[PDB]
């Protein structure tokens, strides 16, 4: 009895395949900002995929790019959770 060599990986990407990812000059990247915020608030309450889903909603709803360049202004972003995990992940006891 074996397991796949690619099993039990999780790749939490900041953005969807093919897309730019956004970073605020002063506050940091939208994704990392939101990831840390959600881990701080929910690592003692929620399974990790549900935390990352909260991160997806935070990035998608609370951020929009502000740029002096019209080409790069008012854009949006969705992170991309890629799970090859085989069990639920809880950071609490």
């Amino acid at each position: 009895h074996k397991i796949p060599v690619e099993a039990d990986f999780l790749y939490a990407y900041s953005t969807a395949p093919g897309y730019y990812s956004w970073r605020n000059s002063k506050d940091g990247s939208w994704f990392i900002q939101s990831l840390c915020a959600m881990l701080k608030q929910y690592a003692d309450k929620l399974e990790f995929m549900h935390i990352l889903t909260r991160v997806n909603r935070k990035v998608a709803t609370e951020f929009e790019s502000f740029s002096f360049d019209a080409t790069f202004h008012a854009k949006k972003q969705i992170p991309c959770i890629v799970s090859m995990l085989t069990k639920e992940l809880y950071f609490y006891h």
């Binding site: 397991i3 796949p4 060599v5 690619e6 099993a7 039990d8 990986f9 999780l10 790749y11 939490a12 990407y13 900041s14 953005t15 969807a16 395949p17 093919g18 897309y19 730019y20 990812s21 970073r23 605020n24 000059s25 002063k26 506050d27 940091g28 990247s29 994704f31 990392i32 900002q33 990831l35 840390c36 881990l39 701080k40 690592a43 929009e64 080409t71 790069f72 008012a74 854009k75 949006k76 972003q77 969705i78 995990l85 069990k87 639920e88 992940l89 809880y90 950071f91 006891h93």
Partner: protein, 141 residues
């Protein structure tokens, strides 16, 4: 066994690679604000009891060397492994300060058959980097 075992003696390593300043020959901008990310991540995973290691401005070669080195440690008493990558990127690619690294080369070190003391344990890669040049214009709703 629906949940990973996270009561090993140690939560695990949290490796943070924080690339801010790139060689001008790559034509690549400085990543203002990434120090805020790196410090935020260090504190966050510290409160989760991960042994955090912060790393700044690593070349292509230093990233690969760091990654194999870490994968060759004894992770037997560790519950999980976390790597955060903060850089420029393209689809499938993270940038060292001097050039691109295939993401598959970094993660291959931790494969179930190449890092046996992490076999069966969650390997988390957190990637803040571009994946191409498409822009999401959004939809009003």
């Amino acid at each position: 066994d629906n949940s990973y075992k996270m009561d090993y003696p140690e939560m695990g390593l949290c490796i943070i690679i924080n690339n801010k300043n790139f060689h001008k020959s790559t034509g690549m901008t400085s990543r203002s604000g990434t120090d805020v990310d790196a410090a935020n991540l260090r504190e966050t995973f510290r409160n989760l009891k991960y042994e955090v290691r912060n790393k700044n401005d690593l070349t292509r070669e230093e990233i690969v060397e760091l990654m194999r080195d870490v994968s060759k440690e004894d992770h037997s008493k560790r519950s999980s492994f976390v790597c955060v990558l903060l850089s420029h990127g393209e689809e499938g690619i993270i940038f060292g300060t001097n050039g691109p690294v295939d993401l598959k080369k970094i993660t291959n070190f931790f494969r179930g058959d190449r890092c046996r003391s992490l076999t069966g344990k969650p390997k988390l890669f957190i990637i803040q980097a571009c994946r191409g040049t498409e822009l999401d214009c959004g939809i009003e709703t």
